[PDB]
């Protein structure tokens, strides 16, 4: 049941006790997800527009 | 400021769409010249949704009137509120449909949709970001089924990712103006099964069995069924039209609604329904088991013979929230057999402080259920009696019409039941 | 003096941070109108609270904060709310419409479109720094906005700002407080492409936040006003550190040192007492020993869940009022030789306390009444896991129907990010259950 | 209406309890795996407890206590005894255990041979018995040669060498206790206990034929040859067993059995309320324990082991599976004697 590293100050102060010891994707890369998911976006709408043009 | 443009077509649609911005406008304090008399903030939180503002503070509702012949429009601008809509928003045409989807689709209806989307471009234009749009119509006749139908066709072509709902009366034999009707709903079905997003179904039958053994009223008018239509319309749109703890646009509500793009055919409801004992004050245990019960629904179907996907229930007035979400975890809690175990938390409830005109409170319902495959199969098997016969079809082959549509038409529609069938096991 | 950045994205994330703000205000004195009295240095100083506020030269302290929503309507309240002195317009974004609580339409369809327009807006706050630590990220789980738009923002922080620290504030999505019937998918699309980005998240789940007003403020329909205030203390116990005199937890950085041990299992459980109901006539004051005992029950806890099943990697205990070390010590033997606490058996077995003189700072006629001594316990637990498993069911029930994915292919995402997300909670479930259990 | 759910269709128990439930018309089973439950009849390995108490507006029970397993398995039980200090290593009615775990794989494999070695050299009786989750030798040798041949953890005890042997028949025998533990953690000893006895002489100079030796209802029915001649099945229950007792020893179940019973079962669950109690918890549990006991031949009781999912004897099917209803599952979800139970008092 130790008391280590104990700091005071005026607002309060803090300590630690110890009971026993122990035993990325570039901004390229998100263009890219970003505009695939956007290039599908279009993809499925002109497949809209070409059946109602049908 | 997300703005819905309305659109009524065809006789059905017209009158059920009158009432509607009726009931509504006196939600709202909108008297029959536009002007605003309420005494609420709530009533113009939202006002804007369905209406636009005009110079002097008038409100005009943003609906489109559209027809192909004058009859029902001309009573339209003569009825109660008839002032209040834009004179440029009234289209129609002189010839009429003849009760004849392929005339409403493809001969007479074409030449008049362009200056109907003429009309529609110049309300969305003014809109400062469009919601979507709403369509009231019926589905048995020619011009608000045909051309109804193809007006969606084409408000899709133009805006692609805009939410499209419909209120849509379906024909039934006992409120029948023409043995033609199931070919006309058949036809329309799938256009709706395509090309909306969400389709509230309303069977003139419900309405009429409503009418009588509820309401107790001997023989039933096309004005007293509008009265339940318009209960209702008021009743799906109390949380786009008023403010609430629910921020949702009909995107959001159809993302919750709808989990399979072409189940997006919806049972409402409403309650009370009291024969003229109408004082007596309604508890909540009594909203909720009606608003649940088959006979407040409006789409003649028995929830019992399916399953619910999605359920919304809308409660309005003063009443005990705490005791709303009791009642409401009753009804799941005590007949959980017929929701679908696979859609965690299915059942979702919402609130609105306004009651409508005359009632202490109420209760909308609105079930995406699997039993709405019982009113498509009853449409299917009258139009396989006709069409295995090829009876009345020289009405539409005389509009230019093969038989292979129809085949076609059949065809989508069963398949439409077969989908709801996998669903339903 | 290092600045730190606070980012509030969707409705939950912006009037969370709405209710924060708020309650910083009324701790370190600032009056709504951005004045501090008690600032004698104007225009300029580095003491702790500019870690969280900015000074004009006019006196004026401005949050270091900005609002993100892709719908105007709630950051609108904040522009002419109580406090819409505090920011400038720079500081509040709002798009025209949202994403539908739709995870593909906030990461792809929308964010793509505002998301350089948050970077300038941040950038601009970052230039104000002469060392920024790095950020602090409110947002919902089931927002399409709060999920959606939050893992693409933490992807391009961590490309513009390497090196910086961020921490998040999530909230876990509860059935009786959301019309929402689609959360569950986002909440697992937002963890798996925000995990390998978030160095320490505190997840609190509306559930617990809901038993907690009804249970202790005799609350029986809590509102969003009501969970945002209690959440806000918590959040503030949290960040008093950072805005306040001391030497535990002192930096961004420090969280992830004191709760975070392996990197993945970055989400510790967060416990707060006590919880009292203003309108009572009057409470009886609780000891350190009777708050410090209430750490442990599952009642206060922000996630419904048993510790006594799981294995503990780190615990802090944040004392604000009148608590001295003698009598933490003293309640800590106490409940060691009452309660189920087990540490892996790779981490000391301790308590990292901090201690702040200054109680709890109650909002004039909130519903929290005033306490004279309040506190935190940060516990990094496996028990934790059992709010993963409860989502990643509800996840599976509706995904083996493909239910709902349709509205999200329609916006452009794959099917296959489905699985590839719920995969990478299944390995997160893995590595919980191999430091836990035996 | 209440709603409950079925997740181990192979428990005789519940499988009776939700037969009854069904009868009172005021309950209604669901599919197994709808959530929307009041009461759950879990499963017995992995019940997810984690998702339990989430549901909103209902009130969920289950019959595992999380966490009864450190009570329910052969080795976590000996560990438990021999660390906490509720039971001590000390403790005087559970036989000398040690855990042992096989060299394929703490483990007290040196301590246990220095007590075997200290008993060989003083004379005194030196046999002990392994089995885990069975062989009887008086050689160490050999009883860790069998542990090592396997590849799952063992526990070796000692061996009751003087057990109390009935008459006639010089038969030894084992008494199992119903306990039933409900939501507010106390703890009901069925009034109906089952003695299993052996029907084969006991005989001490030969552990090679484990007829006489395990009194298990499967082994005297299959590997007997004097099954059900004394008592019907092997099967003595608390009135025939006490009046023996009053005849030959002039004594009575009560005083020289029962208390210590009472205190052993007092003493185990009360150990491991702070770790299992739901008391605080978003959801309640409720369990049923079958212990059981060995006697010795100067009327001391030993515990041999806690099963956390017993059987029943089938006389008792019907009393004590409506006693769980009517404490374990109504007293939470109350429907529109002389209890069965003997309510085992503590401080909690
Ligand atoms: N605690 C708390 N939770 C909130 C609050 N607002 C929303 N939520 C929760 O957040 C989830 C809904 O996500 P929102 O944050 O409202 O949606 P969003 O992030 O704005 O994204 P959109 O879909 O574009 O609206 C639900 O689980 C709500 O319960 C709030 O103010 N406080
Ligand atoms: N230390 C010991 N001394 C004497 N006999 C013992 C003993 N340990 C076990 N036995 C005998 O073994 C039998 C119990 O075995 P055990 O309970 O370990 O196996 P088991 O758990 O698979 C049967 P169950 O769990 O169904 O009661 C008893 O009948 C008893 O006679
Ligand atoms: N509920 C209701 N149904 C109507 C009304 N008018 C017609 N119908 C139904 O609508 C179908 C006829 O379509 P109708 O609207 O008259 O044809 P249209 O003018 O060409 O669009 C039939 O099934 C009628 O029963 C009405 O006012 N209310
Ligand atoms: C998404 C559902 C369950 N919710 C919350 C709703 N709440 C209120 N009115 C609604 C809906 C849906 N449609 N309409 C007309
Ligand atoms: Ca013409
Ligand atoms: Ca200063
Ligand atoms: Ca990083
Ligand atoms: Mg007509
Ligand atoms: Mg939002
Ligand atoms: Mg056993």
Redesign the pocket.
Known sequence: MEVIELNKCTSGQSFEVILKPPSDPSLEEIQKKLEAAEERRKYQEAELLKHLAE | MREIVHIQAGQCGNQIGAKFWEVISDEHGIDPTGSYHGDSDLQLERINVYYNEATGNKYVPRAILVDLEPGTMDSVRSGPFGQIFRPDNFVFGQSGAGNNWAKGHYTEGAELVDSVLDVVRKESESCDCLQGFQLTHSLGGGTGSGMGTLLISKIREEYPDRIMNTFSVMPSPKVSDTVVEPYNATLSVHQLVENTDETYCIDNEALYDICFRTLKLTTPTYGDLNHLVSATMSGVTTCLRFPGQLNADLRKLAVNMVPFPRLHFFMPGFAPLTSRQQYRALTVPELTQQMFDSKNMMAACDPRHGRYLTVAAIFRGRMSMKEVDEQMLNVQNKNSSYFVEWIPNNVKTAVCDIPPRGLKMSATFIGNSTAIQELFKRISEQFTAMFRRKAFLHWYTGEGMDEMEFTEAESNMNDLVSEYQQYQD | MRECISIHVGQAGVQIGNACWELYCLEHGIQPDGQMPSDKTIGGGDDSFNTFFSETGAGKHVPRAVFVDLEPTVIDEVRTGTYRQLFHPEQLITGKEDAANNYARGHYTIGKEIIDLVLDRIRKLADQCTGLQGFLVFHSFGGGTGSGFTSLLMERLSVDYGKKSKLEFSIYPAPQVSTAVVEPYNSILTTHTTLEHSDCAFMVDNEAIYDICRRNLDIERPTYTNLNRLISQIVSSITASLRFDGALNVDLTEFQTNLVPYPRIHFPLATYAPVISAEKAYHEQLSVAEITNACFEPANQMVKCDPRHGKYMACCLLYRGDVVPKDVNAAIATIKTKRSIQFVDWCPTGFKVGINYQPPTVVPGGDLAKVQRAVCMLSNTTAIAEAWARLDHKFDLMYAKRAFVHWYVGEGMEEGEFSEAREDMAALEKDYEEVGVD | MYTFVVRDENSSVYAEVSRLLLATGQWKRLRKDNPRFNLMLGERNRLPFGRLGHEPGLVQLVNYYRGADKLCRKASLVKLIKTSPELSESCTWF?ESYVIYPTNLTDEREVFLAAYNRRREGREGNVW?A?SSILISSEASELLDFIDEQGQVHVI????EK?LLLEPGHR?F?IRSWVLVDHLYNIYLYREGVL?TSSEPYNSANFQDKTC????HCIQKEYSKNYGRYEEGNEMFFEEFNQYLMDALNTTLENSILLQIKHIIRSCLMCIEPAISTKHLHYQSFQLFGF?F?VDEELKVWL??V?GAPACAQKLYAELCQGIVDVAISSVFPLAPTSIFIKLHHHH
């Open positions: 036989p018995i089995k005890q000692k061996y009751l057990p030894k084992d299993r030796h395990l009194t298990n059981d060995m041999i082991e099963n």
